[PDB]
């Protein structure tokens, strides 16, 4: 019913996403990025939206056009899924602690498209995430969610009030995104 | 069931109010005031109210006692809808991005009359939003919101996290008042 | 009694002024000046004097010499009503409290002519108050007041104490410039 | 003619208040909080209302919820007193000195509710006045005179200008409300 | 089906704690500590629990480490109550308007023990609310939110957005944590 | 009824003090500083007394002794002319506009002994008024106000709001003593 397949071939990267918005939490995400995996997991796992993420890129460069395309390719799955939006709660809002940090995101899904995040601190824009695999710079974070609301046509506000760590700081964003999401895209029985 | 009809004859103007609380967004509003109608109207329409305004007032010395005289009236409204308030959700909160802005507004329907108005950016305290017909200057929000507080008996408090546009900063508070409202008068079934 | 009636022509406007010190209330305004009509009435009311203002001016240039010729003409009146000034109370003063407005004045009726007016907030020195007719910029407060003071020959002290709306602060003070005359004018009994 | 008997039954407290507008300084305060029947009987007295209160409450807890209760019973005396406040001064200020301190009140009756508490020390906002009793924690007088204004549906600006002693900030401010008020009630002669 | 009986005998205290997640706010408090008790009674009540709270201790030193033991053996029962926490929104937050005052609290269920309290103005570490009974110190807020998050195992973050009055600050925030937990424990239809 | 007479017998100089609280204006006062004479005489002036002030000193040392004895003396005479003080408004508060200059006064006639003088501008402290007789140092007007008070046993509080010239600001405040003075002593009809 709502739900989307959307293929995205660019020079740089190679995209295929499968969306349903009214899912179970079903979701398989593989870009080469781990650490992205795990946020796109997490994103589409506390939206409760089923979701498959496939994607191979010019990781050797870095993972950052692997992470846009991708991102792209999520907001466009997202605003089709979304249809024409009708008797939908169109609000939706989510505050996530983890920790020490606690982030907030807040949605209008009929808005025009629109983005702002504020109060990440300052270390982010330049703090690596790195393990046995391609690393993830959190500088991207802001990437992320401006690619997303601009091809889903959406008004998306992340905020983070505060916190230390990046992996928290970071994760609970990309949970706040989608807990907003997720009550947003619930029918209103009004 | 949860409805009320207000009638308020003053010296300076003259309105009808009529008010379903469990409504469907059926909102007409007319107060001689254009940018004041659109407002109430995204109030009325984003609270799920059925909503009937029709008012008429001293137009010609500007907009203040009639944007008062309706608010009061409509406070009035709100709060002999309400009844002995029995059974509701009680509190109700609602964020609301509009572009480049956040605001967002809580309420307690059973708490004493209050207002506390805070973060609307300094400019609004002067800025006129004018059209072709009587023009809205913004410094009356607060005045609205107060009204409604004080007329309705509960507590409303409105923010703006931020925000640019003065019609945005204005729209965004007033629809944040409509769904924390809207959350507030909801059956709670417990 | 104490009674006056003042014409004054000039090249940039027609005023009559009828005025009555000892009246009940009796007041009709009509300057062109819609607000301006509404602060007169407001301050013929609140000093309990009966007072007719009729006045005709280049309101298309803006209020600004109409307003003046007025409070010009209306000062005048005060002075001759007043007379010889015997046997009345002198000095008055007035606290106006309006919503979250407080404004003061005080009077030395046999003083000689001066107006002090301070506290205003800043944003008052280009506000404008503007409906469906010729709008009231709030810059014009101060030059009311002086022209009062200079043409009824008295000591007028204009406060604002704190206020945050034009409307208010502006009618605050000219309902404190009222009950502040009405005490002074008042026959002294000692 | 101007009286008003009030019962106030909540689940914190039980409140009757009886009230003589036209008083001669008759009063008899009993809230279980004697702080608050001192000030409450300066109040009465130096209002010249005749003036019951009586009034029990969860004072095992604090005195916050009978004090609250108290002032919200007893403007909703003044209120209905009050009538339709016809042929009254309307207005009403005092000024209080107590000792080093100077406190002061103003009011306008027929304006729509509305408390502003300005001047109070800081130190006023975690003074506690003890005896042999249940004690009186300052931080409450500005929730006092908020629920008076509430609840009589006036405008109460209430102000100390300096002063050091708590006792007596808190009296001046007290006695300066009753003053205020009783100037305020008076029938005008005009 | 979602109950606790806990019981903790230390050397300073005697609690009895019996709870139901799914209840209908029957509440009875009794720790002899009566702001203690009005503060869990709001707790009880606005979360929907049902919870009965039994407790004596060294009372005569202060109100610490009754105050503390309860909430102990509060955060114990609530983690036992919980069970695997299977199904349920996880996720809660809630606004408190209450007067002045805005406070809020967020929650996460499942995440690892952990709190964060900001936005308590500083007289709170030295208020005292007294009554005729033992009082109740305002700096134990703090530890009554870490010793509920560490002994039920989760993520709480309680904040005052602003306010004034020691009574509304601390009642807005357990009020929070109430309604943040109730929307958390509820069974999650997805 | 309400009279007095002082003599005050002194090393420094001889003052006799002839009081009627409830007099017209009959006022002579020769106290050999011509400035104190002129502030004197507009004391009992606009206090409305009947008031002979007669009084020699050590003016070749400077005006202090014969202005502090005769204030003194004057504070006496005030004191045992008001008697038991039953009966009268007792409060009594009074703004004075001279040009420039706004001075206030308030008294409590039946409160302790107790004077605030504040916002008087610093180079009264060490201004002269001169002519061609014995001159008059401003830094006595604290002097003079602190003298009467504790010799008649009332509270005053004298403020200088503003102001520029020594004679107007020194003038306005012994106006606004005497007007503060006059309201406070006369009869209270409840
Ligand atoms: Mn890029
Ligand atoms: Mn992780
Ligand atoms: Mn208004
Ligand atoms: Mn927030
Ligand atoms: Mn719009
Ligand atoms: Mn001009
Ligand atoms: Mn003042
Ligand atoms: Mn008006
Ligand atoms: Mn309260
Ligand atoms: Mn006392
Ligand atoms: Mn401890
Ligand atoms: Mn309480
Ligand atoms: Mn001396
Ligand atoms: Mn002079």
Do not use: W
């Not at 992205?36 to 950052?64: C, K, N, P, Q």
């Not at 504020?118 to 391609?134: F, K, M, R, W």
């Amino acid at each position: 019913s709502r739900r989307a397949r959307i293929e995205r071939r660019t020079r740089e990267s190679d995209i295929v996403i499968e969306l349903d918005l009214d899912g179970t939490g079903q979701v398989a995400v593989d870009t080469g990025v781990p650490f992205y995996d795990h946020m796109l997991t997490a994103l589409g796992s506390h939206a409760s939206f089923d979701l498959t993420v496939r994607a191979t890129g010019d990781v050797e460069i870095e993972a950052h056009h692997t992470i846009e395309d991708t991102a792209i390719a999520l907001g466009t799955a997202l605003g089709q899924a979304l249809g024409d939006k009708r008797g939908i709660r169109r609000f939706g809002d989510a505050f996530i602690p983890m920790d020490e940090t606690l982030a907030h995101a807040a949605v209008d899904l009929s808005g025009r498209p629109y983005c702002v995040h504020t109060g990440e601190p300052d270390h982010l824009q330049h703090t690596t995430i790195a393990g046995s695999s391609v690393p993830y710079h959190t500088v991207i974070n802001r990437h992320v969610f401006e690619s997303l609301a601009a091809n889903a046509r959406i008004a998306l506000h992340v905020r983070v009030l505060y916190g230390r760590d990046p992996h928290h700081i970071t994760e609970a964003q990309y949970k706040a995104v989608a807990r907003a999401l997720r009550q947003a895209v619930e029918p209103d029985p009004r």
